[PDB]
Amino acid sequence: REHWATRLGLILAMAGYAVDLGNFLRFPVQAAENGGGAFMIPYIIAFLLVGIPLMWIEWAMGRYGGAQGHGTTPAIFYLLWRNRFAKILGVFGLWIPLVVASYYVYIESWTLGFAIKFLVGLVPEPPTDPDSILRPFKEFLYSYIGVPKGDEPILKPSLFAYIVFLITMFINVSILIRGISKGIERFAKIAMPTLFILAVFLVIRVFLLETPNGTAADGLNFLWTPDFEKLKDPGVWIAAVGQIFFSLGLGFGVLITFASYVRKDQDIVLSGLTAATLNEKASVILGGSISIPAAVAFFGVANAVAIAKAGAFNLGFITLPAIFSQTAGGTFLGFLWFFLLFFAGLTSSIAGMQGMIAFLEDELKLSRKHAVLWTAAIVFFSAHLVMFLNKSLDEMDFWATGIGVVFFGLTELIIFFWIFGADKAWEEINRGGIIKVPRIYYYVMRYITPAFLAVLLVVWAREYIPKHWTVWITRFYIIGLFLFLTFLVFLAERRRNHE
Ligand SMILES: COCCCC/C(=N/OCCN)c1ccc(C(F)(F)F)cc1
Ligand code: NA
Ligand code: NA
């Protein structure tokens, strides 16, 4: 079985996964909409009562399974719980990242394409007024994606956008086919520094942004000025818990696959706590210092609420590009921004697609080449649904991330900490650990963490269970994916009986 070479690279790859577009875009929006600086109160608590405990568990399950030559949840759940229902629930952790990858890699290709178009100067040039600046870029994005003009739910992406997607896939395969250490870990040692440099530079250039409408100081002002009156809203505490899941990448079975390449007695306590902190630092220090400030600096603090309500996607694919076409040398700033984003996603997309690569290796005994080429084949095929069918992207995100963070994460708790046994579990986490997990966390892992995860589920349940016909096309496919994966798991246990 393959293994991580260095402890540094391990943390960088785990952080590589955790840090992506959400750190720079999603997180700053959630904070401003939910109390600003006051949002740091429930966010840190959730980091301590949910994020950190659950992180350690996925690291534990991974290493525990990796020592037995299994990196995925269909096998691992069957090791924590000798049952048929454990193998089925395990498929979900093979299904979730595979669904995300069907849309995630494609959006990752957008950043790359934009980065290319921005670098060569193939971008709109306005013209005055805010809608006169945004519209040439709103339309720039819509022509790349192929946003439907008529009533049809049909997208028509550009040939270029399609070609960049093919290139993005090829890049992923390039890194992935070289393996854990010589591919992912090697690239994680190059990307993360390159990422940090790009962030710092953008942070610096943004703080220098001065327009007649405002400054960057007004941006960091609006974003971080605490509104404690919003702490009364349960929805703020719900968003915070949800944000931590999203921030750390919990409930997608990605960590579990990675940790399974960590050796039997190597530390997972301190190593995890490090990679987790790197992401949080990247979010609060770098991510919340670029997007929102630059948005407020150009449009003023008067539109700061409107900007945050416009969503994270508009902020990063329309708003910020439009601001860049108005600043000195902003076309290169557009390129550094989209190249910052491209790497952030790429370090995540190679991480997520590994689970399916691991399965084909560990359970179906496929070579690494075949495992990558078929995984690439599957994600490439399924992506055509995202590329051509309008709102298919949303349906996949809803089901994958929805079930992923709200169902499957809780399942990891119960199986490992309630079915497999809390004491046996606790030893598996602390074993070989440089530092030991605080004795208080035993109660947080066993009660507090699943109690929260139950509530996040239920509130999510009570709102989304009640909440067009073409959505069935996407549902039809992703269900077909689950059946397909059940079948592979089925074939996996039948090959093992023969040998
Ligand atoms: C809402 O956008 C999708 C996020 C799902 C979780 C995500 N975490 O990555 C870094 C944490 N912020 C993720 C999961 C799977 C994949 C992959 F596409 F690689 F499977 C990529 C990102
Ligand atoms: Na993150
Ligand atoms: Na990443």
Side-chain angles (χ1 to χ4, degrees), residues 17-18 20 97 100-101 103-104 246-247 249 252 348-349 352-353 397:
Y17 164 66
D20 72 334
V100 175
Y103 68 91
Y104 194 88
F246 267 125
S247 181
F252 299 87
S348 291
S349 72
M353 282 190 296
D397 171 272

PDB file of all heavy atoms in Angstrom, residues 17-18 20 97 100-101 103-104 246-247 249 252 348-349 352-353 397, ligand 1:
ATOM      1  N   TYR A  17      -6.683  19.930   0.401  1.00  0.00           N
ATOM      2  CA  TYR A  17      -8.078  19.556   0.235  1.00  0.00           C
ATOM      3  C   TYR A  17      -9.000  20.600   0.861  1.00  0.00           C
ATOM      4  O   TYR A  17      -9.848  21.172   0.177  1.00  0.00           O
ATOM      5  CB  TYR A  17      -8.335  18.175   0.848  1.00  0.00           C
ATOM      6  CG  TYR A  17      -9.799  17.864   1.071  1.00  0.00           C
ATOM      7  CD1 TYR A  17     -10.671  17.729  -0.003  1.00  0.00           C
ATOM      8  CD2 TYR A  17     -10.307  17.703   2.353  1.00  0.00           C
ATOM      9  CE1 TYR A  17     -12.012  17.449   0.197  1.00  0.00           C
ATOM     10  CE2 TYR A  17     -11.644  17.419   2.562  1.00  0.00           C
ATOM     11  CZ  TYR A  17     -12.490  17.293   1.480  1.00  0.00           C
ATOM     12  OH  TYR A  17     -13.820  17.012   1.679  1.00  0.00           O
ATOM     13  N   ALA A  18      -8.810  20.853   2.154  1.00  0.00           N
ATOM     14  CA  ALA A  18      -9.665  21.760   2.923  1.00  0.00           C
ATOM     15  C   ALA A  18      -9.763  23.174   2.341  1.00  0.00           C
ATOM     16  O   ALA A  18     -10.860  23.724   2.220  1.00  0.00           O
ATOM     17  CB  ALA A  18      -9.211  21.807   4.379  1.00  0.00           C
ATOM     18  N   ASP A  20     -10.199  25.716  -0.377  1.00  0.00           N
ATOM     19  CA  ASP A  20     -10.593  25.978  -1.763  1.00  0.00           C
ATOM     20  C   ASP A  20     -11.460  27.235  -1.874  1.00  0.00           C
ATOM     21  O   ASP A  20     -11.456  28.076  -0.970  1.00  0.00           O
ATOM     22  CB  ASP A  20     -11.300  24.771  -2.394  1.00  0.00           C
ATOM     23  CG  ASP A  20     -12.699  24.553  -1.844  1.00  0.00           C
ATOM     24  OD1 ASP A  20     -12.961  24.961  -0.691  1.00  0.00           O
ATOM     25  OD2 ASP A  20     -13.539  23.964  -2.563  1.00  0.00           O
ATOM     26  N   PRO A  97     -18.526  12.033  -2.886  1.00  0.00           N
ATOM     27  CA  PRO A  97     -17.501  12.814  -3.590  1.00  0.00           C
ATOM     28  C   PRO A  97     -17.556  12.616  -5.102  1.00  0.00           C
ATOM     29  O   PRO A  97     -17.169  13.510  -5.852  1.00  0.00           O
ATOM     30  CB  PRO A  97     -16.190  12.256  -3.027  1.00  0.00           C
ATOM     31  CG  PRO A  97     -16.519  10.866  -2.637  1.00  0.00           C
ATOM     32  CD  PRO A  97     -17.935  10.907  -2.136  1.00  0.00           C
ATOM     33  N   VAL A 100     -20.082  15.145  -6.325  1.00  0.00           N
ATOM     34  CA  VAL A 100     -19.500  16.482  -6.243  1.00  0.00           C
ATOM     35  C   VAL A 100     -18.515  16.708  -7.384  1.00  0.00           C
ATOM     36  O   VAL A 100     -18.566  17.729  -8.066  1.00  0.00           O
ATOM     37  CB  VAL A 100     -18.781  16.709  -4.897  1.00  0.00           C
ATOM     38  CG1 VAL A 100     -18.093  18.060  -4.884  1.00  0.00           C
ATOM     39  CG2 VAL A 100     -19.761  16.601  -3.747  1.00  0.00           C
ATOM     40  N   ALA A 101     -17.636  15.734  -7.594  1.00  0.00           N
ATOM     41  CA  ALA A 101     -16.652  15.788  -8.667  1.00  0.00           C
ATOM     42  C   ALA A 101     -17.274  16.009 -10.050  1.00  0.00           C
ATOM     43  O   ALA A 101     -16.648  16.622 -10.911  1.00  0.00           O
ATOM     44  CB  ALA A 101     -15.814  14.530  -8.663  1.00  0.00           C
ATOM     45  N   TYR A 103     -19.606  18.005 -10.810  1.00  0.00           N
ATOM     46  CA  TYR A 103     -19.766  19.446 -11.015  1.00  0.00           C
ATOM     47  C   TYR A 103     -18.552  20.266 -10.561  1.00  0.00           C
ATOM     48  O   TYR A 103     -18.241  21.310 -11.151  1.00  0.00           O
ATOM     49  CB  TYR A 103     -21.072  19.978 -10.397  1.00  0.00           C
ATOM     50  CG  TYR A 103     -21.180  19.966  -8.877  1.00  0.00           C
ATOM     51  CD1 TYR A 103     -20.779  21.058  -8.121  1.00  0.00           C
ATOM     52  CD2 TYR A 103     -21.747  18.893  -8.211  1.00  0.00           C
ATOM     53  CE1 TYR A 103     -20.909  21.060  -6.753  1.00  0.00           C
ATOM     54  CE2 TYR A 103     -21.879  18.893  -6.844  1.00  0.00           C
ATOM     55  CZ  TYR A 103     -21.456  19.975  -6.121  1.00  0.00           C
ATOM     56  OH  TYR A 103     -21.586  19.976  -4.755  1.00  0.00           O
ATOM     57  N   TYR A 104     -17.849  19.771  -9.544  1.00  0.00           N
ATOM     58  CA  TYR A 104     -16.725  20.495  -8.959  1.00  0.00           C
ATOM     59  C   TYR A 104     -15.572  20.711  -9.943  1.00  0.00           C
ATOM     60  O   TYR A 104     -15.077  21.827 -10.077  1.00  0.00           O
ATOM     61  CB  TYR A 104     -16.231  19.791  -7.691  1.00  0.00           C
ATOM     62  CG  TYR A 104     -15.306  20.649  -6.871  1.00  0.00           C
ATOM     63  CD1 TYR A 104     -15.805  21.516  -5.909  1.00  0.00           C
ATOM     64  CD2 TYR A 104     -13.935  20.615  -7.078  1.00  0.00           C
ATOM     65  CE1 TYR A 104     -14.965  22.316  -5.168  1.00  0.00           C
ATOM     66  CE2 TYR A 104     -13.085  21.412  -6.341  1.00  0.00           C
ATOM     67  CZ  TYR A 104     -13.607  22.261  -5.386  1.00  0.00           C
ATOM     68  OH  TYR A 104     -12.778  23.060  -4.642  1.00  0.00           O
ATOM     69  N   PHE A 246     -18.561  22.309   5.775  1.00  0.00           N
ATOM     70  CA  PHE A 246     -18.125  22.750   4.458  1.00  0.00           C
ATOM     71  C   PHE A 246     -16.658  23.204   4.449  1.00  0.00           C
ATOM     72  O   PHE A 246     -15.885  22.814   3.575  1.00  0.00           O
ATOM     73  CB  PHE A 246     -19.043  23.871   3.951  1.00  0.00           C
ATOM     74  CG  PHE A 246     -20.187  23.382   3.096  1.00  0.00           C
ATOM     75  CD1 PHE A 246     -21.505  23.691   3.413  1.00  0.00           C
ATOM     76  CD2 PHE A 246     -19.938  22.620   1.961  1.00  0.00           C
ATOM     77  CE1 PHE A 246     -22.552  23.240   2.618  1.00  0.00           C
ATOM     78  CE2 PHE A 246     -20.981  22.170   1.167  1.00  0.00           C
ATOM     79  CZ  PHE A 246     -22.288  22.480   1.498  1.00  0.00           C
ATOM     80  N   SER A 247     -16.279  24.026   5.426  1.00  0.00           N
ATOM     81  CA  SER A 247     -14.908  24.520   5.517  1.00  0.00           C
ATOM     82  C   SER A 247     -13.883  23.392   5.605  1.00  0.00           C
ATOM     83  O   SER A 247     -12.899  23.395   4.867  1.00  0.00           O
ATOM     84  CB  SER A 247     -14.744  25.466   6.707  1.00  0.00           C
ATOM     85  OG  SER A 247     -13.416  25.956   6.765  1.00  0.00           O
ATOM     86  N   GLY A 249     -14.336  20.134   4.997  1.00  0.00           N
ATOM     87  CA  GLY A 249     -14.544  19.064   4.040  1.00  0.00           C
ATOM     88  C   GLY A 249     -14.965  17.766   4.704  1.00  0.00           C
ATOM     89  O   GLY A 249     -14.594  16.679   4.260  1.00  0.00           O
ATOM     90  N   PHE A 252     -17.610  13.840   3.352  1.00  0.00           N
ATOM     91  CA  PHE A 252     -17.484  13.538   1.932  1.00  0.00           C
ATOM     92  C   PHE A 252     -16.585  12.330   1.708  1.00  0.00           C
ATOM     93  O   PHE A 252     -16.294  11.964   0.571  1.00  0.00           O
ATOM     94  CB  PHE A 252     -16.961  14.760   1.173  1.00  0.00           C
ATOM     95  CG  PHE A 252     -17.862  15.952   1.275  1.00  0.00           C
ATOM     96  CD1 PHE A 252     -17.747  16.835   2.333  1.00  0.00           C
ATOM     97  CD2 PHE A 252     -18.842  16.177   0.325  1.00  0.00           C
ATOM     98  CE1 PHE A 252     -18.585  17.926   2.434  1.00  0.00           C
ATOM     99  CE2 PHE A 252     -19.685  17.263   0.422  1.00  0.00           C
ATOM    100  CZ  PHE A 252     -19.557  18.139   1.477  1.00  0.00           C
ATOM    101  N   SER A 348      -8.159  20.342  -4.217  1.00  0.00           N
ATOM    102  CA  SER A 348      -9.324  19.687  -3.640  1.00  0.00           C
ATOM    103  C   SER A 348      -9.855  18.581  -4.552  1.00  0.00           C
ATOM    104  O   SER A 348     -10.247  17.516  -4.080  1.00  0.00           O
ATOM    105  CB  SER A 348     -10.425  20.709  -3.347  1.00  0.00           C
ATOM    106  OG  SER A 348     -10.051  21.575  -2.288  1.00  0.00           O
ATOM    107  N   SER A 349      -9.855  18.834  -5.857  1.00  0.00           N
ATOM    108  CA  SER A 349     -10.415  17.887  -6.817  1.00  0.00           C
ATOM    109  C   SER A 349      -9.573  16.623  -6.955  1.00  0.00           C
ATOM    110  O   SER A 349     -10.103  15.548  -7.222  1.00  0.00           O
ATOM    111  CB  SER A 349     -10.614  18.540  -8.187  1.00  0.00           C
ATOM    112  OG  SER A 349      -9.377  18.755  -8.840  1.00  0.00           O
ATOM    113  N   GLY A 352     -10.541  14.616  -3.735  1.00  0.00           N
ATOM    114  CA  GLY A 352     -11.848  13.990  -3.761  1.00  0.00           C
ATOM    115  C   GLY A 352     -11.930  12.797  -4.690  1.00  0.00           C
ATOM    116  O   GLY A 352     -12.524  11.776  -4.343  1.00  0.00           O
ATOM    117  N   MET A 353     -11.331  12.915  -5.871  1.00  0.00           N
ATOM    118  CA  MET A 353     -11.374  11.831  -6.849  1.00  0.00           C
ATOM    119  C   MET A 353     -10.531  10.625  -6.436  1.00  0.00           C
ATOM    120  O   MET A 353     -10.596   9.569  -7.064  1.00  0.00           O
ATOM    121  CB  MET A 353     -10.942  12.328  -8.230  1.00  0.00           C
ATOM    122  CG  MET A 353     -12.012  13.112  -8.968  1.00  0.00           C
ATOM    123  SD  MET A 353     -11.555  13.433 -10.680  1.00  0.00           S
ATOM    124  CE  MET A 353     -10.129  14.477 -10.441  1.00  0.00           C
ATOM    125  N   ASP A 397     -25.564  19.326  -6.170  1.00  0.00           N
ATOM    126  CA  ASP A 397     -25.013  19.973  -4.986  1.00  0.00           C
ATOM    127  C   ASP A 397     -25.938  19.805  -3.792  1.00  0.00           C
ATOM    128  O   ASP A 397     -25.485  19.563  -2.673  1.00  0.00           O
ATOM    129  CB  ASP A 397     -24.770  21.461  -5.246  1.00  0.00           C
ATOM    130  CG  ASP A 397     -24.399  22.220  -3.984  1.00  0.00           C
ATOM    131  OD1 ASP A 397     -25.320  22.694  -3.283  1.00  0.00           O
ATOM    132  OD2 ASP A 397     -23.189  22.347  -3.691  1.00  0.00           O
TER     133      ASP A 397
HETATM  134  C1  LIG B   1     -20.446  23.243  -2.270  1.00  0.00           C
HETATM  135  O1  LIG B   1     -19.351  22.942  -3.030  1.00  0.00           O
HETATM  136  C2  LIG B   1     -18.904  21.515  -2.952  1.00  0.00           C
HETATM  137  C3  LIG B   1     -18.169  21.268  -1.583  1.00  0.00           C
HETATM  138  C4  LIG B   1     -18.166  19.777  -1.069  1.00  0.00           C
HETATM  139  C5  LIG B   1     -17.040  19.499  -0.042  1.00  0.00           C
HETATM  140  C6  LIG B   1     -15.638  19.903  -0.637  1.00  0.00           C
HETATM  141  N1  LIG B   1     -14.675  20.186   0.346  1.00  0.00           N
HETATM  142  O2  LIG B   1     -13.426  20.507  -0.323  1.00  0.00           O
HETATM  143  C7  LIG B   1     -12.705  21.454   0.400  1.00  0.00           C
HETATM  144  C8  LIG B   1     -13.472  21.911   1.648  1.00  0.00           C
HETATM  145  N2  LIG B   1     -13.960  23.250   1.525  1.00  0.00           N
HETATM  146  C9  LIG B   1     -15.256  18.994  -1.784  1.00  0.00           C
HETATM  147  C10 LIG B   1     -15.684  17.600  -1.852  1.00  0.00           C
HETATM  148  C11 LIG B   1     -15.341  16.848  -2.934  1.00  0.00           C
HETATM  149  C12 LIG B   1     -14.587  17.406  -3.999  1.00  0.00           C
HETATM  150  C13 LIG B   1     -14.218  16.580  -5.195  1.00  0.00           C
HETATM  151  F1  LIG B   1     -14.696  17.163  -6.337  1.00  0.00           F
HETATM  152  F2  LIG B   1     -12.892  16.472  -5.332  1.00  0.00           F
HETATM  153  F3  LIG B   1     -14.754  15.361  -5.105  1.00  0.00           F
HETATM  154  C14 LIG B   1     -14.187  18.768  -3.933  1.00  0.00           C
HETATM  155  C15 LIG B   1     -14.535  19.538  -2.835  1.00  0.00           C
END
